[PDB]
Amino acid sequence: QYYKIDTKEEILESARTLAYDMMLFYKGNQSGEIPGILPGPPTEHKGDYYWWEGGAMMGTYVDYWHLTGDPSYNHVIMEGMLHQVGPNADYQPPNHTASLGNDDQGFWGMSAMLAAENKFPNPPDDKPQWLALAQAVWTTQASPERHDGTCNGGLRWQIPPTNAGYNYKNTIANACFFDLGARLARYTKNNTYAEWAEKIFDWLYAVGYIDHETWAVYDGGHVEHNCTDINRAQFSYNAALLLHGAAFMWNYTEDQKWKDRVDNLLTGILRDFFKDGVVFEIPCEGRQGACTADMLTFKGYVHRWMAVVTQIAPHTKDRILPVLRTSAEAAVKQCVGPPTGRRCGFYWKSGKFVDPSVDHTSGAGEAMSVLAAVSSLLIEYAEPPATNETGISRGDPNAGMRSRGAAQHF
């Protein structure tokens, strides 16, 4: 094993080296390149990664600085986050229409929310501010044309009606909107965010994407079948994102129903995704060559989000932190690949380095996931998410409501 994680100082050093190796994949700060994205999209043969994964990377580094205190990458990350906001400061840049799912937009909004929660340095005065960006994403996702009567509600996966997948109402789109609403409620103390979060969670439960008996979290269903053709694939990030949002709602409302939802979601996650203490991507990890670029990132989000759950729902700490520790130990045990002696693969439970080429990418998602897992080992030393009581960001009462906003020509 190359990385050591047995003391705070060892974790900090390992996380710093992991942050370096992940950054080697990113070219957006170099002359002639585009800030905020990893190489891609594969549809243009420019690289392996889609736009939303750039947004996920930005958030991973906002968390990295929050957890470690290392500001080395903060200027690169600020540049990337600001470059992708679009003309209406809503993370809907029209050049990226083909990638404009509600989840894709949502992940950028969640990175902006995280920047506000973590007191990440503010953009210049003339540029969109982190809270305002999160508010704009949430507001566009609450817009009436995104909430029709099919399946009695819920967001569709895609924003443009002509995008493939507009007929799929999936968990992740709804989970992103839920999570944003719960987090905006806690930060701003505005109850309208919370009422929408409640509504969307209740929809996910009613439609049966949350299993009423086991609290497994399925993938979605199609409008032409009234959402009854449930795709029962269980992706780790769907259950973990609902757990995260539910924890924010528990912290904000102190309503026992939310504590029960946290506990039930958590029981399900530990049962389904943790194998002998190691996170495992059950729909694809069971054999090599099946996980897509998107799926290689999910276990990193699981780690970072579950770590935050322990701060805002502290009764969960003893159930979560020991399991994240064993999962991160497995992550680092397999970061031993050539040519560096520290290259990271994905198959943590297996105990062995597998070249990311088996899953047809250069390995950025695997690197991101190990960075997230190791950094989040420092959660016990970190401040909890800030609210507007101590945060430094600024909001916008008209976020998402500009006259040139895309909803005005839907």
Ligand X SMILES: N[C@@H]1[C@@H](O)[C@H](O)[C@@H](CO)O[C@@H]1O
Q: Which does 50 bind (CB under 5 to 8 A by kind): ligand X, Ca ion, none?
A: ligand X
**Interface with Ca ion includes 359 (CB under 5 A)?**
no
Closest distance to ligand X from the beta carbon of 54 (Å): 11
**Interface with ligand X includes 54 (CB under 6 A)?**
no
Cβ-based nearer residue to ligand X, 158 or 251: 158
Nearest to 297 by CA among 244, 355, 217, 356: 356
Cβ-based nearer residue to ligand X, 2 or 166: 166
Closest distance to ligand X from the beta carbon of 164 (Å): 7
Cβ-based nearer residue to Ca ion, 358 or 386: 358
**Amino acid symbol at 344:** C
Among 13, 219, 272, 294, binds ligand X (CB under 6 A): 294
**Interface with ligand X includes 40 (CB under 6 A)?**
no
For ligand X, how many residues bind (rule: CB under 6 A)?
Answer: 9
Cβ-based nearer residue to ligand X, 3 or 52: 52
Among 34, 98, 206, 270, binds ligand X (CB under 6 A): 98
Closest distance to ligand X from the beta carbon of 179 (Å): 16
Tokens matching residue 212: 């009423």
Whether the ω angle into residue 41 lies within 30 degrees of 0, i.e. cis, is: yes
Kindly report each contact of residues 192-201 with a partner whose C-beta sits within 8 Å and lies 24 or more positions away, as own/partner. Answer: 193/138, 194/249, 194/252, 194/253, 196/142, 197/245, 197/249, 198/249, 199/153, 200/154, 200/155, 200/174, 201/242, 201/245, 201/246, 201/249, 201/261
- H or E element at residue 364: helix 364-375
Helix ranges restricted to H, 164-297: 171-188, 191-207, 236-253, 256-273
Cβ-based nearer residue to ligand X, 93 or 123: 93
Closest distance to ligand X from the beta carbon of 284 (Å): 14
Whether the ω angle into residue 121 lies within 30 degrees of 0, i.e. cis, is: no
Q: Which does 360 bind (CB under 5 to 8 A by kind): ligand X, Ca ion, none?
A: Ca ion
Cβ-based nearer residue to ligand X, 73 or 218: 218
Closest distance to ligand X from the beta carbon of 117 (Å): 24
In DSSP notation, 279-300 reads E--TTTTTSTT---TTGGGHHH
**Interface with ligand X includes 91 (CB under 6 A)?**
no
Give the β-pairing of 278-279 and 274-275. antiparallel
**Interface with Ca ion includes 360 (CB under 5 A)?**
yes
* Distance of alpha carbon 310 from alpha carbon 325, whole angstroms: 13
Cβ-contact 344, 363 below 8 angstroms:
yes
**Interface with Ca ion includes 46 (CB under 5 A)?**
no
360 is in an annotated binding site: yes
Sign of CA dihedral 148, 196, 123, 73: negative
Residue facing ligand X at closest CB distance: 101
Range 116-175, binding ligand X (CB under 6 A): 158, 163
Region binding ligand X by CB under 6 A among candidate stretches 65-73, 98-106, 139-147, 222-230 = 98-106
Region binding Ca ion by CB under 5 A among candidate stretches 42-50, 68-76, 200-208, 298-306 = 42-50
**Interface with ligand X includes 101 (CB under 6 A)?**
yes
244 is in an annotated binding site: no
Kindly report each contact of residues 321-324 with a partner whose C-beta sits within 8 Å and lies 24 or more positions away, as own/partner. Answer: 321/379, 321/380, 322/277, 323/270, 323/274, 323/277, 324/373, 324/376, 324/377
Cβ-contact 2, 17 below 8 angstroms:
no
Cβ-based nearer residue to ligand X, 52 or 248: 52
48 is in an annotated binding site: yes
Residues that bind ligand X (CB under 6 A): 50, 52, 98-99, 101, 104, 158, 163, 294
Could you list the residues known to form a binding site for Ca(2+), using ranges: 48, 104, 360
